Every structure is written in structure tokens, then in C-alpha cells.
Design a binder for this molecule. Structure first.
Ligand SMILES: C=CC1=C(C)/C(=C/c2[nH]c(/C=C3N=C(/C=C4\NC(=O)C(C)=C4C=C)C(C)=C\3CCC(=O)O)c(CCC(=O)O)c2C)NC1=O
Ligand SMILES: [Cl-]
Ligand SMILES: [Cl-]
Ligand SMILES: [Cl-]
Length: 242
């Protein structure tokens, strides 16, 4: 569950990943949650082929506003830690997609990505999100990274950095906390939408999932531990279900 106290991975994960896992779990803990059963009621899985083992712990929930809320923690061998999180919105409410991805090795966090990604056909976040996000101001990060082409799905507020030091790690986690606070508040005040608008949002979410499946960084990690067929099933059915 969301206490993370019974997580076997948590104690061994990069400190920034631990703090973000805790912050996400804390944001969700008091919501009107129900379990969301992944395919094959997946929770914990491990695999190895010719190289290192991959271990994944899945936690997934749902609420009336969020069709699927996934928090995945993973580790490859002793050298690679990953946090994956997506809140998939119920299209009826027109909310954007919260996502984040953190990858860390022995040298520290290599990649930290977080966004509230659009679902509208105009590729804009709803007005209330634009207002609240603008008020946070532009955060300063020394080592920004450019998104790959499939990353056109992310908003103009997307963070994609290599944190340079602890100050930046903590600044990133705080900005994710800020995104979550905005998002959970907007989920309370969101107007239920028309059938045509609901359809528009559904389309946006489908596109998001299809584009995320183009990420060969995820796919290679899965393939090296479980093979091509397993990775394709995992990405298309577990992570980014259409
Ligand atoms: C669950 C298993 C899972 C694995 C194995 C995983 C691996 C993974 N994701 C990565 C990058 C990345 N990951 C993302 C983004 C995301 N990815 C997401 O799953 C979500 C929700 C977003 C954004 C909200 C982006 C944009 C990159 C950079 C891709 C690139 O450099 O080509 C990288 C490369 C890190 C680096 O270049 O420093 C790895 C190894 N991510 C995972 O989530
Ligand atoms: Cl691409
Ligand atoms: Cl690659
Ligand atoms: Cl390799």
C-alpha cells in the first residue's frame, strides 16, 4: 500500500527517488482511493536473461477523477534505480496527465522528468492550470535536457534535467509537490464535461500513451531483463494502456 513501509526496494533506492515516492504516496493517501488491478494483478516482478536482474514493484489505484494512478519503483542490479508515476485522468473531468520519471545510478540522478501534460486538442493545459503554474515562476536548473521527438506530448512546463546537486534535487521534488497540489485541487473544482469534450480528452490521453510507447530507453531496460514480447506487453498493457 501507500505507506511504502513494506516496500522491499524503497530502502535501497536513490535518496531523491525515495523522497519523491514518499511525496507522491502522501499526496494520494487521503484520496477516495480504490485498488486498480493491473493485468494479471501484477504487483511485484523480477526477471533476468543474460545480464542483470530487473525488479519492479507496482502500486496502482483509482478515484472518480483518476482512472488509474500508477507508482512503479524499479531497480536493475545494484546500478540503476527508477521511479515511474502517471495519474491517468478520467476523461469526463478534462484533467491533464500528471507524470514523472526519475532514473539514477551510482553517480547520482541522471534523469528527472515531471509534467502536467495536455489532453485538449489545442495542446494547451486548462486555463486554471496555466494560471497556477505561471505563479510558481520559472525554476532554475543548471543541466536541462532536451526532450526526444515523441516528447512533443509534454507541456511547456515540463521539467527534464540532470540535477546538479542536492539543492537542485530538492528544488525538483518541491516543484513536483507543487504540481500535485495544483492537480489535486483542480480535481475537486473541475466541471464535468460534454460528451464531445470528453471524447476530445480521451483522444489526448490515447495519443499520450501511444507516444510514450516510443521511448526506447524504457523498452531496452525491459527487454534486457525479460525480452521483446514481455516488454511490448508491459509497455502497452501495464504502463501505457490505450
Ligand atoms: C516503468 C519502467 C521505466 C524504465 C525501465 C525507465 C527507464 C528510463 N527512462 C529514461 C528516460 C526518459 N524517461 C522519460 C519520460 C517518462 N517516462 C515515463 O515512464 C513517464 C511517465 C515519463 C514522463 C512523464 C523521458 C523523456 C526520458 C528521456 C528519453 C531519452 O533521453 O531519449 C531512461 C534514460 C535515462 C537517462 O537518459 O539519463 C531510462 C533508463 N523509465 C520507466 O518509467
Ligand atoms: Cl522519437
Ligand atoms: Cl535506446
Ligand atoms: Cl548495456
Amino acid at each position: 500500500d501507500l505507506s511504502l513501509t513494506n516496500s522491499s526496494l524503497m530502502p535501497t533506492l536513490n535518496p531523491m527517488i525515495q523522497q519523491l515516492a514518499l511525496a507522491i504516496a502522501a499526496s494520494w493517501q487521503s484520496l477516495p482511493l480504490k485498488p486498480y488491478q493491473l493485468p494479471e494483478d501484477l504487483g511485484y516482478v523480477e526477471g533476468r536473461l543474460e545480464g542483470e536482474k530487473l525488479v519492479i514493484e507496482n502500486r496502482c489505484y483509482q478515484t472518480p477523477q483518476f482512472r488509474k494512478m500508477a507508482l512503479e519503483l524499479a531497480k536493475v542490479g545494484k546500478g540503476l534505480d527508477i521511479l515511474h508515476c502517471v495519474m491517468f485522468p478520467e476523461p469526463l473531468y478534462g484533467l491533464p496527465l500528471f507524470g514523472c520519471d526519475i532514473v539514477a545510478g551510482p553517480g547520482g540522478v541522471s534523469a528527472a522528468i515531471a509534467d502536467l501534460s495536455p489532453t485538449q486538442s489545442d495542446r494547451q493545459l486548462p486555463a486554471a492550470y496555466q494560471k497556477s503554474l505561471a505563479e510558481l515562476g520559472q525554476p532554475e536548473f543548471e543541466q536541462q535536457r532536451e526532450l526526444p521527438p515523441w516528447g512533443e506530448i509534454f507541456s511547456e512546463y515540463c521539467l527534464f534535467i540532470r540535477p546538479s546537486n542536492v539543492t537542485e534535487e530538492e528544488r525538483f521534488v518541491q516543484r513536483v509537490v507543487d504540481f500535485l497540489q495544483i492537480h489535486c485541487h483542480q480535481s475537486i473544482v473541475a466541471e464535468p464535461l460534454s460528451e464531445a469534450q470528453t471524447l476530445e480528452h480521451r483522444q489526448g490521453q490515447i495519443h499520450y500513451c501511444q507516444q510514450q510507447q516510443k521511448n526506447d530507453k524504457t523498452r531496452r531496460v525491459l527487454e534486457k531483463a525479460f525480452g521483446e514480447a514481455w516488454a511490448e506487453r508491459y509497455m502497452s498493457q501495464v504502463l501505457f494502456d490505450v
